[PDB]
């Protein structure tokens, strides 16, 4: 009703498109533009105060991009399919010194997404849950964000019960990828800060902006 999963799906479908780290950073910068477009299509997001929109995306962008790259990659063996039509294989990530983080993405996200055949609706909903993070520092109205989160997961749950009546734990199994996503997010972010600090990797403007105070 107020948080229709078909709209969340529509948001997902609407934005559908040398150095592995460089490619990743390049793909992330381009995908940040489309993430903004994605968020505007999440019911009620555009009705939040503009500062809260800014806060939710600054708090979530890395988790949200990781979620997308991971789900986009369920059809490949040991790599990630980035938005731009390029792949990054495990070996290539290992060769660039980011094998551990990359493997975590493969093992905790891509593989688990594949094993349960997480669909686009469930991904979108998980993403909207991540976007509506009421813990984000500075929100004008944390409770409204928590409410929107609640509406999303109520809808996701009903959706899973209807579409997967066979699997009573699927809803929880979905939500229980969120911690790994949080963790992997934080790690990918620290890597990124290091890349910027060292100056070893070109970082485009919107990605750069996301890494500013």
């Amino acid at each position: 009703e107020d948080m229709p999963v078909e709209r969340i799906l529509e948001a997902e479908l609407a934005v559908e498109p040398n150095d592995p780290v460089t490619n990743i950073c390049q793909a992330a910068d381009k995908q940040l533009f489309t993430l903004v477009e994605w968020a505007k299509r999440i019911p009620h997001f555009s009705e939040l105060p503009l500062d809260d929109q800014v806060i939710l995306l600054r708090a979530g962008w890395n988790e949200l991009l990781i979620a997308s790259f991971s789900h986009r990659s369920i059809a490949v063996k040991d790599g990630i399919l980035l938005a731009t039509g390029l792949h990054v294989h495990r070996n290539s990530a290992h060769s660039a010194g980011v094998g551990a983080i990359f493997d975590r993405v493969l093992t905790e996200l891509v593989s688990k997404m594949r094993d349960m055949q997480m669909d686009k609706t469930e991904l979108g909903c998980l993403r909207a849950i991540v976007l509506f993070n009421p813990d984000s520092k500075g929100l004008s109205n944390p409770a409204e964000v928590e409410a929107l989160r609640e509406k999303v997961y109520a809808s996701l749950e009903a959706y899973c019960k209807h579409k997967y009546p066979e699997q009573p734990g699927r809803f929880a199994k979905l939500l229980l990828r969120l911690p790994a996503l949080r963790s992997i997010g934080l790690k990918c972010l620290e890597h990124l800060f290091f890349f910027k600090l060292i100056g070893d990797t070109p970082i485009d403007t919107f990605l750069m902006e996301m890494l500013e105070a």
């Binding site: 503009l50 800014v54 600054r58 403007t205 902006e209």
Partner: peptide, 10 residues
Amino acid sequence: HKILHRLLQD
């Protein structure tokens, strides 16, 4: 945060 604000307007 220049770019994010701009892209959020239209």
